[PDB]
Amino acid sequence: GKCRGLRTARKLRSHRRDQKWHDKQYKKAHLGTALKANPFGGASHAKGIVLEKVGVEAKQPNSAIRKCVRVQLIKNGKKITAFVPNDGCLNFIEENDEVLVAGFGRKGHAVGDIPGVRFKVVKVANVSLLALYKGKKERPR
Amino acid sequence: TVTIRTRKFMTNRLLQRKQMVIDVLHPGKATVPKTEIREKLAKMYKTTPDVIFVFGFRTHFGGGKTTGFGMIYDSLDYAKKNEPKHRLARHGLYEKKKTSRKQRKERKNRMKKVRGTAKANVGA
Amino acid sequence: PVARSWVCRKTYVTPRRPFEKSRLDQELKLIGEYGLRNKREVWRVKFTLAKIRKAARELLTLDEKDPRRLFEGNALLRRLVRIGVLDEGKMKLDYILGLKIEDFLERRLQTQVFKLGLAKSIHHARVLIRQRHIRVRKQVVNIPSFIVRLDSQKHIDFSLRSPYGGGRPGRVKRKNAKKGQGGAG
Amino acid sequence: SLARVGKVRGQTLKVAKQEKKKKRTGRAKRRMQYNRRFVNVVPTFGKKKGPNANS
RNA sequence: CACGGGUGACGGGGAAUCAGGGUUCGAUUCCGGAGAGGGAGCCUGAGAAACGGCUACCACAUCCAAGGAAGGCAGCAGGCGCGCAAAUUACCCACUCCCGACCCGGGGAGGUAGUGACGAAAAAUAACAAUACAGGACUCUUUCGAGGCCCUGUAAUUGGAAUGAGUCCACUUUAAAUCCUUUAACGAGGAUCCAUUGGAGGGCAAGUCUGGUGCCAGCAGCCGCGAUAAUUCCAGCUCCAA
DSSP states (O other): OOOOOSSOHHHHHHHHHHHSTTSHHHHHHHOHHHHHHOSSSSOSEEEEEEEEEEEEEOOSSSOOEEEEEEEEESSSOOEEEEEOOSTTOSTTOOSSOEEEEEOOSSSSOOOTTOTTOOEEEEEETTEEHHHHHHTSSOOOO | OOEEEEEEEEEETTTTEEEEEEEEEOTTSOOOOHHHHHHHHHHHHTSOGGGEEEEEEEEOTTSSOEEEEEEEESOHHHHHHSSOHHHHHHHTSOOOOOOOHHHHHHHHHHHHHSOSTTHHHHOO | OOSOOOOOOOSOOOOSSTTOHHHHHHHHHHHHHHTOSSSHHHHHHHHHHHHHHHHHHHHHTSOTTOHHHHHHHHHHHHHHHHHTSSOSSOOOTTSSTTOOHHHHHTTBHHHHHHHHTSSSSHHHHHHHHHHTOEEESSOBOOOTTOBOOSSSSTTEEEOSSOTTTTSOOOHHHHHHHHHHHHHHO | OOSOTTHHHHHSOOOOOOOOOOOOOTHHHHHHHHIIIIISOOOOSSOOOOTTOOO
């Protein structure tokens, strides 16, 4: 503390109440701007519609062509670059398919070699991409 | 080898009965039936087995001890005075109704609509 | 509004660091010494030890000749005596803190059957507990988490309905007898 | 581009799973684990190699 | 710090994390407040601005013979939509209580069944013996080798002994059932009656093993791997965590 009076409790409370807003996590938790700008809306998963598939060039030293999907959500209609995690799992996703999109773990941040892509794909038309990669289930045709 | 002990013995004159907790020890066999329970309580208490109603057996783990509750009345008139009709029907001196509750609710709400003496004509 | 309890409590607490080499070494030695099933079987006894030692520290922080301190201390020492981990001459609340996980695991009924010697191994004793051949005071104990009391330690023997004791033989003996009578005629 | 999806998974050779005796589980698995950790080996001089260490 | 605005604010007893301090949630079985799509008004009645009460407007919506009548599931189940997201159009007043003219009748309050890996507790998927072997506390021998008074483990080498998942008489449980326990007769040697979920550079435990790819495909929460010798990719084996 800075002021050490005997009855400065309202001064300390008002000063800490004004200085909590300068923290990033407190502002992200207590203002509705980030919660409105979040396409999930404070959620963990969201269903959407595949509209196109984009090959994104990777970053710095590690170079690759990552396979992202432009997903248009249902509850907001916003468009998200979602990442297809496993190998060979882009061919399981076609145009105009309802896929499930979640975060990646860094709480809204592009991770590693993939620039500007925050989210990833979990399930593809009520069939998970993990099962499509393992070969346990079959895509309904 | 089936042994019946009676704990928590109580004489309820306001209920006109005796009551006890029955502990049945049966070494190396299955659960004895309520008919054999009533017979052994009859030959123990030297009374008629018609007023001996025993219910609620619980078998402990291992298979050598069961515990239930029992009461012994004085007469069948007193048993029908204060004894539940379902446990009377367990032994067979009473028969309850057979009309099920959903059809009874449907019949009651149909009789609620039609007003007059014709409710007997509405019901069945 | 329904009539039920909604009262539960986790008996185990996972450690803070998941992959400590010394902690995994100690738990692996504990299971390989006392015949346990997994790591939760270690962690729940570790958390009961945490409860007992935390209560002992809370009593030793209290002042001497305090009624709550003497009451809780005598109750905890009575519990330790009746579960049989602490000796009858060591019934003092200052000696609770010098007690160990191995002394808690020595009072398991699997370890008690192995120390009385009616079984062959610790895991074979657990096999006997599973297969229900033993009883404790005319009560079959199927679950090896039974805390054996010091008064009930000498009452551990084979059960009544048991092919290893005074009972009917089992499936393999009946099948061998049936095959022998079918081969004889 | 987007035309090389699943290239390595398409061009590698599929090797079938080798048959094997089924593993003991649970308390027997941890007992066998303790038996292959401690009571079989002896304390030798130098750095002790790992379980999967091969030459 | 009035007034004004916002709240993904009903308030509290409480829940999680916790040294001490605090931080977050609380709609949720206990109490108090508000209401039956939105307001407003009233009879009855001790108690209502009541909605399984009415009376007018807005929005939704049913049958009609076209004159009319009639509704309020944020109750119980159930249906559509919205969704990342959540169960049967079952049985009963027997357990706990309530109502009435009341010992008797009723109660989608409540209780019992069906789905259920939110979650909490216990806990199967084996053990023993014999042979070949690899070694530890002793006697002898400089080693090589021998003995077992005491041992520990491995091996589709072999052997019985025991039990449970399940099927299933019967008893018990219960308003009638269901589940638990007991009990006949069945039911295990690849005991096929087969346990998976993630990783193996560091954090953080675990191959510089084998084949292919060659800054491609892909791995990786962070640093970082991958340009024809990849301990980090894809597969086989092995190991590690639960």
